[PDB]
Design a protein around this motif. Structure first.
Motif, PDB file in Angstrom:
ATOM      1  N   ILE A 103     -10.077  -2.270 -10.388  1.00 56.27           N
ATOM      2  CA  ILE A 103     -10.232  -2.469 -11.655  1.00 56.27           C
ATOM      3  C   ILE A 103      -8.609  -1.633 -11.786  1.00 56.27           C
ATOM      4  O   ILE A 103      -7.525  -2.308 -12.270  1.00 56.27           O
ATOM      5  CB  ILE A 103     -10.817  -1.910 -12.091  1.00 56.27           C
ATOM      6  CG1 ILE A 103     -11.622  -2.307 -12.506  1.00 56.27           C
ATOM      7  CG2 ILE A 103     -10.311  -1.618 -14.009  1.00 56.27           C
ATOM      8  CD1 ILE A 103     -11.727  -3.506 -13.470  1.00 56.27           C
ATOM      9  N   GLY A 104      -8.337  -0.758 -10.879  1.00 56.12           N
ATOM     10  CA  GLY A 104      -6.963  -0.214 -10.985  1.00 56.12           C
ATOM     11  C   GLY A 104      -5.802  -0.587 -10.480  1.00 56.12           C
ATOM     12  O   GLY A 104      -4.678   0.440 -10.754  1.00 56.12           O
ATOM     13  N   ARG A 139      -6.600  -6.053  -8.855  1.00 58.41           N
ATOM     14  CA  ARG A 139      -6.612  -6.629  -9.710  1.00 58.41           C
ATOM     15  C   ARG A 139      -5.554  -6.187 -10.505  1.00 58.41           C
ATOM     16  O   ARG A 139      -5.015  -7.772 -10.491  1.00 58.41           O
ATOM     17  CB  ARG A 139      -7.295  -6.205 -11.042  1.00 58.41           C
ATOM     18  CG  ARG A 139      -7.626  -6.785 -11.772  1.00 58.41           C
ATOM     19  CD  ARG A 139      -8.762  -5.950 -13.539  1.00 58.41           C
ATOM     20  NE  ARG A 139      -7.969  -4.691 -14.190  1.00 58.41           N
ATOM     21  CZ  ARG A 139      -6.654  -4.048 -15.128  1.00 58.41           C
ATOM     22  NH1 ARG A 139      -6.953  -5.207 -15.545  1.00 58.41           N
ATOM     23  NH2 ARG A 139      -6.344  -3.479 -15.050  1.00 58.41           N
ATOM     24  N   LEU A 140      -4.323  -5.503 -10.224  1.00 60.95           N
ATOM     25  CA  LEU A 140      -2.746  -5.717 -10.937  1.00 60.95           C
ATOM     26  C   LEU A 140      -1.925  -6.599  -9.798  1.00 60.95           C
ATOM     27  O   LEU A 140      -1.435  -7.072 -10.624  1.00 60.95           O
ATOM     28  CB  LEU A 140      -2.542  -4.681 -11.291  1.00 60.95           C
ATOM     29  CG  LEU A 140      -3.735  -3.690 -12.185  1.00 60.95           C
ATOM     30  CD1 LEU A 140      -3.552  -2.328 -12.803  1.00 60.95           C
ATOM     31  CD2 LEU A 140      -3.093  -4.503 -13.827  1.00 60.95           C
ATOM     32  N   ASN A 180       4.501  -3.915 -15.452  1.00 63.50           N
ATOM     33  CA  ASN A 180       5.452  -3.449 -15.739  1.00 63.50           C
ATOM     34  C   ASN A 180       5.086  -1.571 -14.963  1.00 63.50           C
ATOM     35  O   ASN A 180       5.907  -0.748 -15.507  1.00 63.50           O
ATOM     36  CB  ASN A 180       5.811  -2.547 -17.142  1.00 63.50           C
ATOM     37  CG  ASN A 180       7.367  -2.177 -17.140  1.00 63.50           C
ATOM     38  OD1 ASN A 180       7.751  -1.969 -15.642  1.00 63.50           O
ATOM     39  ND2 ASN A 180       8.099  -2.430 -17.998  1.00 63.50           N
ATOM     40  N   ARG A 181       5.083  -2.091 -13.505  1.00 59.97           N
ATOM     41  CA  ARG A 181       5.092  -0.697 -12.454  1.00 59.97           C
ATOM     42  C   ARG A 181       5.418  -1.439 -11.070  1.00 59.97           C
ATOM     43  O   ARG A 181       5.443  -2.012 -11.189  1.00 59.97           O
ATOM     44  CB  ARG A 181       3.974   0.216 -12.749  1.00 59.97           C
ATOM     45  CG  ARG A 181       4.365   1.243 -13.896  1.00 59.97           C
ATOM     46  CD  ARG A 181       3.525   2.795 -14.052  1.00 59.97           C
ATOM     47  NE  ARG A 181       2.132   2.665 -13.562  1.00 59.97           N
ATOM     48  CZ  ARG A 181       1.297   1.784 -14.481  1.00 59.97           C
ATOM     49  NH1 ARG A 181       1.532   2.035 -15.585  1.00 59.97           N
ATOM     50  NH2 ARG A 181      -0.011   1.590 -14.115  1.00 59.97           N
ATOM     51  N   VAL A 182       4.526  -0.094 -10.211  1.00 60.05           N
ATOM     52  CA  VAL A 182       5.556   0.072  -9.018  1.00 60.05           C
ATOM     53  C   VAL A 182       4.873  -0.241  -8.096  1.00 60.05           C
ATOM     54  O   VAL A 182       3.407   1.311  -8.299  1.00 60.05           O
ATOM     55  CB  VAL A 182       6.931   1.158  -9.351  1.00 60.05           C
ATOM     56  CG1 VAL A 182       8.131   0.195 -10.317  1.00 60.05           C
ATOM     57  CG2 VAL A 182       7.109   2.372  -8.675  1.00 60.05           C
ATOM     58  N   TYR A 183       4.769  -0.879  -6.771  1.00 57.22           N
ATOM     59  CA  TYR A 183       3.866  -0.937  -5.536  1.00 57.22           C
ATOM     60  C   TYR A 183       4.459  -0.824  -4.543  1.00 57.22           C
ATOM     61  O   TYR A 183       5.921  -1.073  -4.465  1.00 57.22           O
ATOM     62  CB  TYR A 183       3.691  -2.624  -6.062  1.00 57.22           C
ATOM     63  CG  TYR A 183       2.156  -2.668  -6.930  1.00 57.22           C
ATOM     64  CD1 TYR A 183       0.860  -1.795  -7.112  1.00 57.22           C
ATOM     65  CD2 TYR A 183       2.623  -3.901  -8.591  1.00 57.22           C
ATOM     66  CE1 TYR A 183       0.521  -1.904  -8.500  1.00 57.22           C
ATOM     67  CE2 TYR A 183       1.619  -3.165  -9.369  1.00 57.22           C
ATOM     68  CZ  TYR A 183       0.345  -2.337  -9.628  1.00 57.22           C
ATOM     69  OH  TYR A 183       0.259  -2.773 -10.678  1.00 57.22           O
TER      70      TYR A 183
END
Ligand SMILES: Nc1nc2c(ncn2[C@@H]2O[C@@H]3COP(=O)(O)O[C@H]4[C@@H](O)[C@H](n5cnc6c(=O)[nH]c(N)nc65)O[C@@H]4COP(=O)(O)O[C@H]3[C@H]2O)c(=O)[nH]1
Lengths: 175, 176
Positions: A12-13, A16-17, A75-78
């Motif tokens: 989920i956290g 999924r993203l 809108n964040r980084v991976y």
């Protein structure tokens, strides 16, 4: 049964993203790096699953036959890493590998005092974590096509196991 | 005691790695963004610890009085640290680096499990335990501990008294 919670949270956290927009980031990587991510089945996130839970403290792959190359762009980084795989001292493949990091939590629980114990209980939980994740992914098939789970158990001694061979094996049987 | 495992994991695999390099990334941020990250005690990682474990699915802060501005740049892992402006009565009141202690999401999931994995009460306890364990860990690395602050609270499941933005401002304003 905390392997349940761990798997759902990791799905989920995180998974999924990132899974939905992986092909686009891969596209950008291969525009940037002249198609370095290449070989059939190499356009996928390979999630390493050591049932022994031997994820390194830094969470990165550390193996003399696996060499880091660069990262996938954003809108964040991976923080997804691309490595070349060696075979008999030669670059044999290129792929995106990362550990399923919540396995680290299981190793930690096995070190706790006296209560948090059993290597056996950890192993079992790791399997449970794994199959639960697999069961989750089954329902999101399009995104499940963007990753592959590499499940194994690294022995604690002896020299038979090779993580890089394990990966090459998985890639070469893309069936 | 999965709180123990979760905490050591959260420290060793995350905090231990970013805390020593935060000030350099903060410097880089404030060269880029003309000293936006500002106010005493704003040059720190504020880690949100909702004991209810109400971390959003997407892990980000989602509050109408907390507005995202920009990310911290990178120092090789890639780190995802968000800078938000806090609003007080419709006006920007402060700026800070906030994030949830996301292992808390794992505890919420364990409480929703089938029937076995149960108890809002057992989750509260584990959450506090996670928190105090983490505190014990940070206590030993005082220099890097200076680079963050735990914001510990419990968001009620109803009523309108709780305000995350006020919670943060209270923590920033009363930092001694
Ligand atoms: N390994 C770890 N990381 C933690 C933990 N708690 C918080 N984080 C951090 O939360 C940061 C922001 O989340 P994200 O941008 O959405 O992107 C995060 C987030 O999506 C993901 N993540 C969130 N929760 C979990 C989890 O329970 N397990 C795993 N394996 N990954 C998670 O890791 C992604 C990328 O990592 P970063 O960019 O370096 O930075 C991440 C991630 O490292 C933890 O207990 N272990």
């Amino acid at each position: 049964n905390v392997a349940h919670g761990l798997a759902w949270s990791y799905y989920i956290g995180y998974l999924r993203l990132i899974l939905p927009g992986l092909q686009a980031r891969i596209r950008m990587f291969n525009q940037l790096h002249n198609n370095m991510l290449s070989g059939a089945g190499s356009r996928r996130l390979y999630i390493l699953f050591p049932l022994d839970c031997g994820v390194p403290d830094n969470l990165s792959v550390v193996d003399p036959n696996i060499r880091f190359r660069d990262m996938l762009p954003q809108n964040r980084v991976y923080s997804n890493s691309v490595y070349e795989i060696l075979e008999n001292g030669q670059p044999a493949g290129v792929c995106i590998l990362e550990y399923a990091t919540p396995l680290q939590t299981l190793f930690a629980m096995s070190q706790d005092a006296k209560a948090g114990f059993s290597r056996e209980d950890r192993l079992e939980q790791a399997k449970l974590f794994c199959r639960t994740l697999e069961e989750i992914l089954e329902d999101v098939p399009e995104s499940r096509n963007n990753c592959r789970l590499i499940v194994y158990q690294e022995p604690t001694d002896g020299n038979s196991f090779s993580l890089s061979q394990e990966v090459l094996r998985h890639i070469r049987q893309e069936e």
